[model samples]
Target chain A: FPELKNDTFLRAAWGEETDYTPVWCMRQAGRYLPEFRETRAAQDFFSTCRSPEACCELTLQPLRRFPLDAAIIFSDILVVPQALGMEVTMVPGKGPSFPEPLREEQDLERLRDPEVVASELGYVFQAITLTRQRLAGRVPLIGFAGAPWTLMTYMVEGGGSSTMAQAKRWLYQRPQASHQLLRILTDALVPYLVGQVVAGAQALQLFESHAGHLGPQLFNKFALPYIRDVAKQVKARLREAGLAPVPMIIFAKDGHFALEELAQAGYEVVGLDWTVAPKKARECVGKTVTLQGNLDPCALYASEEEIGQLVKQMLDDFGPHRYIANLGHGLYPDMDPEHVGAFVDAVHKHSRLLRQ
Target chain B: FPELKNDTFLRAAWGEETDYTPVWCMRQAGRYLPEFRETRAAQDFFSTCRSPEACCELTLQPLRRFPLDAAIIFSDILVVPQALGMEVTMVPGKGPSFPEPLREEQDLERLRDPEVVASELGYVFQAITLTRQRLAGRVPLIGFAGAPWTLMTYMVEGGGSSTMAQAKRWLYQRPQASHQLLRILTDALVPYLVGQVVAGAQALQLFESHAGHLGPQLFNKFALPYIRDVAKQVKARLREAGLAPVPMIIFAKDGHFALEELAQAGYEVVGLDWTVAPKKARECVGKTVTLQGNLDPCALYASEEEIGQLVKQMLDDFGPHRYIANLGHGLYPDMDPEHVGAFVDAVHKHSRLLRQ
Candidate 1:
């Protein structure tokens, strides 16, 4: 393997001091870049996911345009459910959809057995390996999967929903079924995530994208337990296989309420949405776990100078210790790549100044 | 007005001692009921809003079935924009839509002058008057409108959105235009809200439903100032008209970030979403303002017995003094009316038990 050049992101994830803040955008390799869109045009959404060459192209597109400190593997969280023998389609302009959603306990019989599902995800592992090879260790490549509760939401609700009403109804009406589905998802995700690390992913992010739908009670019951299990089981498996353990991050969007529990939920880092104040999140998560993200993705719409100012202020609020600079959410399709470049420049510039 | 029968909701809004924690679902008068759906089927949405008799019937439907402590007038927040001369339509099952949204500063020319908007909203005032008269002091009739920022998001984006991306982009790129649009909304909202009070609304709620889209910085800059003005100007007009002032509430859905500032902003009550802990919200807002809300609306999907348990737990969290009980947001169209009954009954029953 090529000598590693940048360990800034990994070092910060361990809550260690760094020369400058490591910065990356969630959805860093996404629609915002014209190159990404052009590459994506050549294949259907899942077809792109299936092709290592296509996925590698999209993954490296962002790194070529800017000096991002981390390169997240290019894929969708919906892939986990897609791998579970459920049909999922990515409709252009709309998002992922499962034409046949899990509606009842009987529906559980339709899914593939969770134990052997990771074998079906070989393409993702191949893509990760190819991207790692191409990067030549320029920066860490993040691997991620949707948290079980979140994937369960998509599998039950079928697609994007303003309220995961159907999914939550299942929780109330069929607690046993909800648990059965969540655990099935968890069982599938553990080996899949471990497989990614073995395939050369340097770190992992578990996206509980639908966390805002539940308050503390439901989150504790359904989401939190599965979150703890994924971390515990993945780390255990990695250690058992004699692979070095990588840092893990749990990003629960709109999950300001779950910060305290998530910090202690066995991840090395926590990702925040823009809604949380950096100072408040730091206090809630404590100084142990590193914090990623939290600028409003919409801030990229601002002028380059404004982006720089916003970046400086965000760095100041997070105070350069145990921090990584990122948009509180993913970058949007309409954002200017130059603005993304400004964000990267500002984080590097401001953090160096702060440390001095 | 006939002799008052239920003053508990009013007292709670003012943070006064109440015999029991007052309860009302946010969309108590909604599609969950067979009667409401039947009545709604007879007229187009705007026609229904225009007909005071139809509005009165829907508002009273929930009360007849449950002992709710308050009745919110049946109406839509988009009416403010409609009166501003922007055409809004309600597609059958789809939500509110503006075929011609405010896309640029030039589009501002398409709106009616802010001064004439209250007169255009006479239908709402008539509905409020009829609902109050029909209730005959059975329970306080609450009236509401969308907050300025929330309305601008709708008018700019043209309809329901997951991300208020275009609207926030306006804030970033055309800040002056964003403020101009927000102030137009605030100027129009002031008299419209005051008119509701004049037409027999005993209390008011300003619904900033799109609040979570912006983080603390943009919210404090764009949304907060206009929110302040709406409250200040409405109260001034009501006082000047020689009407006794009514307590006002500000409900910012998904706006856990702005609770402290919202508490200090002019309203007497700060309504919260389910994401905020009752104790933490109280600490943020302090003792002066009453707190309303925050049970997860999906909790109604649980069994009637479970609904009671959740309600009791929510009441315990908010305590007996200085609080009103409501679903964290509106009732979903598919929720069971019996479960709604359970929520109302639980608040009254457990609260009385607590005080005793």
Candidate 2:
């Protein structure tokens, strides 16, 4: 693997002093870029995920346009559930769907054993390795998977849901089965994440995208334990395999109530969605853990100057130290690439100015 | 109106001592009840709202089944926008949608004068009066409207959206126009709420359902001001008309970040969603303002015994004083009617047990 030239993202994630706050985005390599759309046109969503060259190209597309401090491997969180023997198809207008979702405890029998799940995800490792080499040491590569709770939501709900009602039903009605499924997912994620590190991923992010749906009690019981275990167990595995441990981020979108607990969840970085106030989040997480994200992706619809102003305000709120600048959520499909550039440039400009 | 009966909800909303915590559910008279579905089958959603008998029957449906402390007028928030001359349709499977949403500043010309909106909504007033009469003071009737920011989202996005990107885009890109629309909504809501009170509403609730989309800064700028204005203006109007001011509640779903501001935003009661911890919310809002709500609606999917335990824990968290028990959000269509009865009975049973 090529030597990483810019380790600002890693340094920030580890709470080390850096020249400026590192900036990247959740879906930096996405439909917003014309090149991404063009390249994506050639294959279906999962087909693109299955191809290393295509994934590498999508990963590099954003880096060519913006001086992002890190490049996250282009892959879907649904891949883990799919590898567990569930069928997942990305519907054109709708999102990922499972034709037959897990509805009862007996349905758990269909899933493959978590022990061999990593072997099925070799394509993701190949993409990460290929993308890391293709970057020629420009920046670090990030690898991520959905948190167990979030992935279980997809597997149970079968698609994007406004309320995540069915998934929560399982939590309320079938506690034992819910825990069993969550444990299976957590077991799958530890090795899946460790394999990414072995395949040259410099850092890791676990996206608890559906965290908002679960209140504190349910989240603490179902989500937080798995979130903490993934970070702890992955680092232990990496050390056992003689690989340097990577900084891990727990990005629990809309999980503001759990910030205090998440800061102690063993991850070096805590990620926030746009709704949380930066000062409040900082107060909750304290100084040791780094914070990433929280600019509303819709702000990209504004003019470049307006985008710059919003970015400046966001950077001011998050401050200059122990921070990684990015959107609170992923970039929407309609966001302007130029305005995204404004966000990137503004973070770079304002953070340098703040340091001075 | 008939002689007054239960006033537990009214007393609780005023932050006064109550024998036990009063309980009601948002959307209590909803599709969860089999009879509600049968009654709703008689008319289209809006047509049902336009009919006094249908609205009254629906409002009293849940009260017939559960010992609820309050009954809200069974009317849709979208009616206000429709009265403002924006065409809204209730799509069968897909909730509400605006056929021609406001895209730019120039689109403001499409709305009717705010002063005339109440007259157009005479049907809602009629429904409230009829329902209030039918209730015979069994429980206080609550009136509600979507807060300005929430209504503006529907007007811009034309329907339910996960990100509310288009509406937030209006906030970022067209600040003047966004304020203009929000002000229009506030102006329209004041008269509409006053009319409900005139028609015998005992309390009011402002639902800021889309509040989670905005960060604190944007919410303070755009949502908070209008929310404050509605409460203040409505009270002043009631006083001027020689009508007693009703206790007002502000329920900002997922607005966990804005609780402190909301506590000071002129509402007697501050409502919460499931994600907020009851103890933390009381701490933020202080001891004076009554807190309503916060059981996850999905909890109703559990067994009846489980619902009782959940309700018991929820009531204990809120305590027995200055609190009204309710769900974090509305009841879903699929929720069992029997479980809802369990929730109401549990609140009554456990709250009294707490008082002892």
Candidate 3:
């Protein structure tokens, strides 16, 4: 691997003091950039993910524009389900979908063996390895996967759902089958995540994007266990492989009620959605873990001046230590690239002021 | 008015002690009942609301099936937007939508004067009047409207949106116009809500369903004032008209961040979504106001015995004072009616046991 240049994000994630708050955005290399759109137009969504060169190019495009503290690999979360033998498709505006969703307990038989699923996700590893080399240590690269519960949602509901009723039905009515499927996902995620680090990825994020759909009890029973296991097992395997474990972040997008549990969930960092109040979240998680994110993504719709002001307030709220500046969620497709730049620059400028 | 029979719901709303916690569902008169679907099949969604007899029939359907303590009039929130001159249509499976959404500042011109909207919404008042008469005072009748910010989202975005980005864009990019629209909505809602009370509604609920979309600062600035003003103005007008003000409940579906402010927003009761923890919500809102709701509606997917257990757990979390039992959100169309019976019965049975 090339000599490491910037480790601000890594340090921040490990709850270490940084010169200023490190900054990045989820989906920074997404359609908001015309170049991302241009590159994506050439190939279908998954086709682009399969091509390491394309993935590396998309990953680097954002770095070329903004001095982001990290470069997350340009990939989709549905890849694991696809590797597990579900035929997933991107429906342009509609997002990822499975033509044959897991509707019955019998449907579990259609999935590939969890133990062998990582072998099928080699393309993602190649992309990670190639993007790492291409970065030349300008910054660390982040590897990510959907949390077991989130993946199960897409697998069972077939696509994005407002309610996720079918998945919850399985949880309530078919608890045995639900756990079986969640365990299958957890087993598959472990090797896949471990491989990302072995292939040169510097850090990882587990995206529990659909966490808010479940209440506290259901989340504790069904989602939290898998979230804890992935971090535990992945780190254990990394140690067994004689490799240093990377900083792992658990980002349960709306899991406000589970902060105390997530702080103890074996991850170095906990990410937040914009809806949480920072002071309150800090109270919940306490001081041991670093906190990432929580600015509303839509705040970018404000004027650059307004964005700068909002970022200053956000930096002040998170304060100057153990913080990585980022949006609560991904940048919307229609967001202005310059406004995103304003967000990046404002974080750098204001965070330095906060430290002083 | 018919002689009063059950005032448990009103008593609970007033923070008065009751024999047991009063129970109701948000969309109790909804499609989960075959009879509701049969009645709804006779007319279009809006047309059904237009017919006072149909609305009365739908409102009383669940009361007949379950020993519910309250009946919310069967009407849609978008009726306010429609009364404002937006042509909203129920797209069968797609839910409510406006064919022509308010896109720019000039689009405000198309709306009727807010002061006169109550007259146009006479149909809703008639429904409340007829339903109250039909109930023969068996249970308190409730009326509701979309909170200003929520209605503004529908008027601007044209329908239900996961992101509510376009509406938030108005808040950021066009603050003056956004406030203008919100003020119009506030003016309209005060009169409309007062009319519901005048027409025999015993309680009112303001549904801030999109409350979670904005963080605290935005919500306090844009949503809180209007939420407060609606309550203050409506109560004053009711006093001026020599009628006692009805208890108002502010149910912000995902607005967990704004509970403290909502507690002080002049509402007598604060309704919670399932995502909020009962103990934590009680801590946030304090004990002066009544709290309503928040079992996860999907919990109905469990067997009746499991539903009973979950409801007991939920009731235990809420304890016995200043609380009403209901689903965190509306019931899904696929939810079993038998399970709903379990929920209502469980609340009654367990609440009585807790008192004992």
Candidate 4:
């Protein structure tokens, strides 16, 4: 593999000082770009994931448009459950849907053995390799998977929900089954993540998108242990393979209550939702881990001048130390690409000025 | 006026001593009950709000099912906008939608005068009056409206959104117009809320359901002032009328970041969502105000015994004083009423045990 040209993001991830803050949006290679939409128009959602060349083009699309310091591999988190032998469909507009979702202990029979899961995910690994070789080391590539609890929610509830009532019921009414399912997810993720590292992805992000739904107790019991395990095992596996371990980030969207626990959960970086105040979040997570994200993605809808001011204020609050500038969540589909450009430029402009 | 047969809720609202924690769910009168759905089938969504007798029956339905301590008038928050001359339609499973939402400054012309908004909402006041009269002081009747920011989200975005992007865009790009719209909402709310008290509501709650979407800056500028003003003017109006002012609550769902500001926003009670730890929330709001809510509504999906244990744990954390037991947010429509019974029963059962 070629050496990375811009390792500012890697430096920021490790809390090492740099000339300026590293910046990247969660879904930089996403729908807002016209070229991405055109590429997506050609293939159905999951089909695009199967084609490594397509994934390479979409991954490189944002790098062409904006000077993002990192590129996340273009894939969906639901792919893990699909690899575990569950069927998922990305209905054009409504989001990922599961026609056959895991509900009971009986449903557990449908899944393949967790040990063989990574073999089914060869396409994702292939995409990562192709994207890495194509980039020729412009910036580090980020690989991510859904945290066990979040992936379990998608499998159990079968789709997007305002309330994960069905999933939570499994936690409360069927505690044993819920644990079994979560453990199955954790078992699959460690190998899949290690595979991403071996496939040439430079860093990892674990998305607990549904963490806000669980309070402290539920998170500690069902989510936290597995979160810690994934980090521990991934590092252990990388060392066994004689490959250097990459920095890992855990982003629990809307998981403010669990920040103190998450800070100690063995990741180098923690991602935040827009709702958490930058100062309060820093206080909660303490000084050990670097923090990413938390600007409200809607701020991109603001005028260019307004976006600049907001970005400057955010940079001031988070300070230049141990920070990576990004939206609190992924950029919305309707957000103007120019506004996203403004966000990128402002982070670059202001972080330089802040240090001066 | 008939003496309140059960003033436990009223006393709890005032941060005074009570025999047990008074319990009420935010949407106690909602579609979770079979009778509610059957009645709702007969009348259109707004039509049910228009009829005092229908509203009275629905408000009392949960009281019949469980020993709840409060009865909120059955009405929609969008009625304020509907009365202001915008069109709103309920799409069966999809919830509320506005076909012609306010987009630009010029769209502000579509609204009725704020002063006349109270006159337009006579049906709501009538529902409160009828429900209170029908209850005959069995429990205190509560009245509510969407907070200006939440109402603004529905009006600007034309419906419910995961991200209030269109609404937040207004805040960022059109600051003056955003204030103009928020102020119009505030003007409308003061009268509407005061009228609910005059019509016999024992308390009022302002629902800023979109609170979590904003960070400290946007909330302080747009949501907080108007929330403070609604409480201030409602009290002033009630005082002028020679009626005793009712205790008011500001329930900013998912507004964990603004708890300190909201506690100081002039309402006697500050409501919380389930995401906040009870102890942490208590510390933020301080000792002056009464606190309502914050059991995860999904906890009701647990078995009856599990619900009891969770409630026991929740009550222990909150302690018995200056606290009211309620779900952090509205009960989901799919929730079983029997489980809701467990919630109310547990609050009464465990809270009395705690005090003893």
Candidate 5:
């Protein structure tokens, strides 16, 4: 393990006081880096994610090129289904697809139990532990898991969806079974995240990728309780282990209706996706926890000047206190690396200017 | 025009204030209704949209089942590109795809003047006129045009997009050209919507479908000013014609950031998509204008009891005064017709209870 540290991100992630806001972008590890592409030239996306060493390499790829404040372990959320013994495949022209989807009450039983998944998904945690060890003290290793409802959506739907028509049908028609699925997933997730923290992940993020689809009621009943439970358990586990209480960041993407409730959901940080405004979020969430994100990833394609101005404006809007500079969502595959540099530099520059 | 003398819908659209809130969804004309499917079977989707009589038939189909308070003209935002003489087509399983895209400065010249489109898009305006006459005062006929940036986004991207990567390229690289397109579309949109009012549209809505993508600054530059301009022009035109200005509603599907500025945009009604809470909207726009909309459309697929509770909840949150009931988004293809009826009835039934 190397000495010294870049712990500003972990500090901001926990709602602690920090002079400069830390920054990271989702998909920061992927296709943008030339070296990442070079590494990928040897293997495809699925293989890289499945192999722990390759996953560890991909996780730290962005840090080699940019001074990112945190490194999220590289693994797709769909892996949970694969671990549950669902047949998953990523085709080129099309995205990921699954056959033999879990449709019946009986199909639910095929899902791996928490203990079962740990033996399977343990490779992911092992990657996090290994990557953290490699990063040493440079930057914090962030562990993440898919929010239960989101993971279940893909499993039930049988693949990636644009319309989600089938999933909505099952959700609305036999809500009891959907709830049954969510209950099982939630039961599994608490220990899943606790295991990640024990494996040396300094912080954790819950990726509620499909949080946008539900209206508030379902969000409250289904996603919120589980996310809050996971957050609550993660912190408690850290304290019990005599490992310091790990700060948690929960990003319920597109669930704007639940922002205030998410703030109160036992997480120390709330990541706002691009859909919500920072100024509005600053007022809405209102200093209860660190606000970690919300610049539209599309802004990265803009000229350096626009990127600088937008970064400065966000800095001015969010101002001081518990904030972390980050993109509204994941970066697209085609985004320019120079844009990343300009964006990062601009955030640091303007945040300092605002402080002055 | 068919006598709207008894149309509570038309009355509400004019902000004419009624004993009860008038309601209609944005996709009232869409596939949720069985009759709507029958109408589609009678004709192709685009052809029906392009035919005034067909559009009128489709527009009234929801009312046949749901008893909604209003009917929007049966047209797509991509219609503006067709009106602009762009080669736009619905890609069956895919969304709208424009084969000939406006990609550069030279391509910008390909966009015809507002007058040219004002005539070519007459089918939609004609659809508005014809539907109003057919309703015979059953409800207000809403005329809509895409917001400048939204229409321009489609025009630039050449159709419905997943990432809108190509358009963002223009936005960041050629900011002037991007704003210029927004300005042109804005100038055209003012007259376009005003003419819909002249042609007997009781109220108008600006569909800024992609406004949320711009984050804040670009939203301010590209969306906010143009929104104000359209509102101003519509009002000024009403004055010049010595007609009472129709109530206007601006709906930027995901543009939660600009809600306050939208309140200042001189629109009589502001629409919210489902992602945010109704109370947050009441807090954001701050009682200056009546807020319309914002139930999750996906709720239409839920059970009658579940849908009833959601509707009752919305009424309690944003009803009784300065409010109108409607879905935050629109009807997906598979929504149950009975569920929609339950929703419409629940709004009427529950709001009355909430009021008491």
Candidate 6:
């Protein structure tokens, strides 16, 4: 197992065909893990996300019990908005909420400041630094930012939504103005993400959480182009500095269309949510880049044996060499963490045997 | 305006291409109209769906305000379960809920008695009968039943679902038992829909709302085969009565993947939801059947000009003939009544000129 230390995960991150598939789940270290709840009994949901040690500690926790191949920096998508000066909070059972949503052109201009609050963001860099040192490179760490369109959705809609009524109205009726906000986010995000890679992160993933909201035409015009810019600019900026350019993974949660467009958009791995079938996704993206994902998170609630078979189905679908193991979306909370152990172990077990 | 009395609606429903289109939405007779809301306020949702006179009144209300070419009977899918002896109720904003959901074999046995509430089921026939008489050779009337899999979803889950978790798990994990429920509903629904046709419904549409839940192999074996049985049985029963068979419409909402199979599954029209581009749907279903639908309902809330432009986009997407104009989904409950009127007018105006 010591042979796996340092840069091994990075090798896989760089598209090395491996004997075993790397695995992780979105929000793997959150409420779904009981130990996380125990750790945060004293503070709010954002409390752990905002503290470097708390972030690192929670990020590393899933790797402890499960054979996860990577740890994501534990933070919120709204961290950028909070770091950029907006009111954000997490209600107990409801989800993240914005008290004073920035809806006007002035608000957009105000948030366009490239200047970031180091103190507010300090904990995250400390998190990446701490978690990286602890890992001694057992696996690559994925640093991520919310995609431009996703960030603007929360800001304009005022909160998490099923309908995103205000956001859709503004997007369709007044799209010119909506892009005004997307442009501001696109400008500010590079410093934030590059700052993570600079702090011992080996790779990055973008969370385009609300990508499903846009129709296909809007997706091509608005979402894909900016995301392409993010990957192109980030990698190019890093290459100039002589640091190894990390592969950028784009996880378009619940978005099934635009696969061919996105894979060709220059991401190393296409992260799919559970509703997307992996074979269909691979076929859509073709063989140009690696494909990751999509087990319906509900499967974790089943027995360990069934979990193994589900992972086997994914392995057979995506092919072990070019696939990265992950959930379609965040696992449901109140899952048996031990069941995730069974999931990872079964994946490594089945995949390694298949490759041989 | 005398052309309104022409019953071209029926001609279009029967797949005979005409000078212009005939269109009616799935839930056209509901909350978008303020008059419909007044009836809901006076009576509970379930009561209103069950009371023949009240249901008929709501159906006619939409016609009074808009120049709709057809009237859909007013009722909820869960009404079938309620008629089967489940206590279903809508509590304010919280959607329909069932107190004692069907679980054990005894409950299944109770529902198997086709005549248990056949007397109470007279409401659906009465509503269709009364509304048909009111239309008086103008336009047409559509009777609908939630197809077996969809009704089974409601019956098993006890209400509306976001994930289809309970229903899907039962379908996959325990297929034999799930088919038990599907078979019983299939057996009962034939008589129920036959009653609607006998009461003067000139058309029938089966709503398979959770159409996206199944993969192809599973859908054909479980849902598609059963729906074919229901369709075949309904038409055969109609033909025996010496009446012409009605053009059956099957709206498997979000069943984008299985469009080819569904188009050929004995349905005369395939209703596509807003997400499916009309051109792609036409390619899959072919030109033999009429295509109905696919304007994003949210467009109605935009400016009147935007609604017109969007309607024109739909007409341009499907072109002039063999397409019925309608929304992708229901009219949202929150739509301003003026916007609904604007939307209805836009569809009519756009389709009429396109025909010319």
Give me the runs in candidate 3 sitting further than 4 Å from their true place.
B1-356
The weakest ten consecutive residues by lDDT in model 1 chain A span A103-112
Residue pairs that clash (backbone atoms under 3 angstroms), model 2: none
lDDT of the candidates, in the order given = 0.91, 0.92, 0.92, 0.91, 0.79, 0.78
lDDT for each residue of candidate 2 in B200-285, tens digit (9 for 90 to 100): 89999999999999999999999999999999999999999998999999999999999999999999999999999999999999
Docking class of 1: incorrect
List native contact recovery per candidate, as a fraction of 1: 0.00, 0.00, 0.00, 0.00, 0.00, 0.00
Relative to the unseen true structure, what is the C-alpha lDDT of residue A73 in candidate 3, on a scale of 0 to 100? 98
State the lDDT at A157 in candidate 3: 99
> For candidate 6, lDDT tens digit of each residue in B55-90?
867886776666778888887777677777778778
Per-residue CA lDDT of candidate 5, range A1-356, in tens? 45538889877876777777788888898777777788777766666775778888888788887888888888887777676656566767577776457666656644556556766677778787788788877898888888888888888787878766776777778688988887777767777778888887888888998888888987887778778777776677668878777788888888789988988888888888887878888777877789988789999999999999988888887877889989988888889999998888888777777777
For all the predictions, what are the DockQ values? 0.01, 0.00, 0.01, 0.01, 0.01, 0.01
lDDT of 1 by residue, B88-150 (tens): 999978988999999899999888889899999999998887677556567899999999999
What's each prediction's TM-score?
A: 0.51, 0.51, 0.51, 0.51, 0.49, 0.49
Cα lDDT for residue A313, candidate 2 = 90
For candidate 3 chain A, the 10 contiguous residues with the lowest summed lDDT are: A103-112
Candidate 3 docking quality: incorrect, acceptable, medium or high: incorrect
Q: Give per-residue CA lDDT, model 1, range A1-356, as digits (tens).
A: 55569999999999999999999998889998998989999868988998899999999999999999999998888888877756677877798887667776766765667887888899899999999999998998999999999999999999989999999999999999999999999999999999999999999999999999999999999999999999999999999999999999999999999999999999999999999999999999997989998899999999999999998889999998999888888888899999999999999999999999
Error of model 6, residue B125, in angstroms: 73
The segments of candidate 1 whose C-alpha lies over 4 angstroms from its true place after superposition are B1-356
Steric clash pairs (candidate 5): A295-A328, A302-B172, B2-B133, B3-B136, B3-B137, B4-B137, B10-B140
Error of 6 at B8 (Å): 61
| Candidate achieving higher TM-score, 3 or 6 | 3
CAPRI quality band, candidate 2: incorrect
**Using lDDT as the measure, what is the rank order of every candidate, best first?**
3, 2, 4, 1, 5, 6
